Ligand binder design. Sequence first.
Ligand code: FMN
Ligand code: FMN
Ligand code: JDB
Ligand code: JDB
Lengths: 313, 313
Amino acid sequence: MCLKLNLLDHVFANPFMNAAGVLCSTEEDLRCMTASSSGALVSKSCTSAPRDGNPEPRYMAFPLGSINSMGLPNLGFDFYLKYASDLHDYSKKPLFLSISGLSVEENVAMVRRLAPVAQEKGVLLELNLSCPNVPGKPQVAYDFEAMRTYLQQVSLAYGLPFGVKMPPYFDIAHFDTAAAVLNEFPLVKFVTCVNSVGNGLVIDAESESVVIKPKQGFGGLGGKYILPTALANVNAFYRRCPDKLVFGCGGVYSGEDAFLHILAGASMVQVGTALQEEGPGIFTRLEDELLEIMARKGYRTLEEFRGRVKTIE
Amino acid sequence: MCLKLNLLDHVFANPFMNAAGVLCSTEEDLRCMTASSSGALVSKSCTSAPRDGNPEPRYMAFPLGSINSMGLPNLGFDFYLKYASDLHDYSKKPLFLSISGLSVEENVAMVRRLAPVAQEKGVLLELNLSCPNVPGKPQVAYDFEAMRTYLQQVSLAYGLPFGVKMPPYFDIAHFDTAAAVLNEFPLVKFVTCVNSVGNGLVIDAESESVVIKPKQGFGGLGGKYILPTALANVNAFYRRCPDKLVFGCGGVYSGEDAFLHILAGASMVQVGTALQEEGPGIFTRLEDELLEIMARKGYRTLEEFRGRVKTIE
Ligand SMILES: Cc1cc2nc3c(=O)[nH]c(=O)nc-3n(C[C@H](O)[C@H](O)[C@H](O)COP(=O)(O)O)c2cc1C
Ligand SMILES: Cc1cc2nc3c(=O)[nH]c(=O)nc-3n(C[C@H](O)[C@H](O)[C@H](O)COP(=O)(O)O)c2cc1C
Ligand SMILES: COc1ccc2ccc(CCc3c(C(=O)O)[nH]c(=O)[nH]c3=O)cc2c1
Ligand SMILES: COc1ccc2ccc(CCc3c(C(=O)O)[nH]c(=O)[nH]c3=O)cc2c1
């Protein structure tokens, strides 16, 4: 009975990893994820220049999840490239590097320079298609023409297999159109579903106030609020992208949550809000919990149930 | 101390009503909602002809909320009109009638017949913009050009103040675009935010199956999962539509939850999943709980705090 996976020409002890942005912004953070029982880690979505990000408070958590408008605080690309190139111990586990340029040219410039490092060290690119667009236009992945442009340019500039981090969709026609766009790009080998459920608003009843300062308190939601939305997007893309892998992300707090993601079609399973709250010890528990569910059901490997969610009649 | 208010030329005992489609499909349902301590009631969204809806199971609820793919089962428009015109006791509370035709023409035909009943009896129209659209196309509210046409045609056909039931949005540009569409129509006097969070997926770990039969288990989410989404949409439209009312719907299970919708800007507060689960006694609890929070805060009116959610500097 085991949680090992072999994909994208890498080997993973188990399917768990952090979600981008959680426990992955500094060298300390990355070493801490490396030391954890996770099967992999991803770096904070970066920009070419370092960023301080939005005013605080910009992240808050509650029993059912979290809200944030961090604003891409990050140490800049050169720092993440250097971590990939010179500091990361690939004998411990694989590394994903997440990029989130504020324009298509910014992304092209980073992926050109990531390429030789990816080829020589085996760092894996996750391109974040919630990067903001032009303000007053929707985020990139909710503008199918911009998304196409981003993927064509990044495909040309990088030339290597990569993956994409997708926001959630809520309309079947969007599932259809988005997967069709992704399916135009053979170098897109994995699809991470989902980023935060955008622009929610948490209000504290006692103080009568929003709980985060940017954007009049509007920000992306994560945690228990979003697990069925995440499961839906994992399975939508699993069913529509048969030549790509799907990584699941959203609402994982337990081995059972991870099991559902994997039944929906998840290969890797990322952990955001729960990891933020509990810390990297969450990885041993998730592993133990998922293995206990597998033992009770008689499953010996992940492939025996991945994507095998049953429908009714 | 009482929760009474006046909106749209009607008087309401309190701000609570059912959400469309919950406890409101049959004559028995409507009389039950009428007998409740709700302030108003809304009928099941209807089509010209009666419909059986989708195969069962088509609704399921859980600790954090519900999923449904009901498929617009309804007794057809002649039945709801007849209810509005001959059966409803307007001395008890106002009535809203929800229409959800599958085309623009269907909606026009229903509203032309509704108008003289609205004039004579004061029944209010809630137009459901989570309706069918043209080939491989998103729901109407997610296709701003179709939304505009629907509203143009309905405003011309109906000629009287009405409201619209909106699906949630997740992107600030979308809020900007949707509110601008709506503000083109002076007869659109209220905006109900929000319908269910579309196309989530609930999976049962023990059976390894989805929990509803239609659409391979995909359906609209309600309940706790959607409260911060619902508050965000209420506030966004409250901010953008200063000459309209906003009705809040989504995740209300307590007077606290209702308090947060009213702080966000809600005039009326609709109850879906929690009503489906608890039954119509919920209305007395919600009234009591809301009055209790008001008392503790020293608020005597809803107007003192509606839309007064505080931001951080
Ligand atoms: C504090 C915080 C920072 C995040 N930053 C990023 C990021 O830099 N890039 C990215 O793709 N997603 C980011 N996300 C989204 C998470 O990766 C994840 O998609 C989302 O939180 C849902 O997973 P969850 O329900 O486990 O939180 C961030 C989330 C949180 C809470
Ligand atoms: C069983 C069921 C039937 C529904 N039918 C309708 C409908 O006919 N028209 C409509 O506008 N919304 C319909 N809804 C959506 C609700 O009116 C409401 O927008 C949604 O459930 C969120 O509120 P909640 O969090 O209180 O459930 C329905 C919801 C459920 C659960
Ligand atoms: C330009 O100023 C802004 C403001 C808000 C942003 C929100 C998300 C993002 C993408 C990064 C990201 C963040 C984030 O850094 O805020 N949070 C998430 O939940 N997911 C994400 O993908 C960039 C922003 C940039
Ligand atoms: C035929 O299969 C479907 C699938 C999805 C639907 C979504 C909304 C509607 C409109 C009525 C409605 C329904 C419903 O009757 O399913 N449920 C909601 O949560 N909101 C609604 O607004 C009909 C649908 C029918």
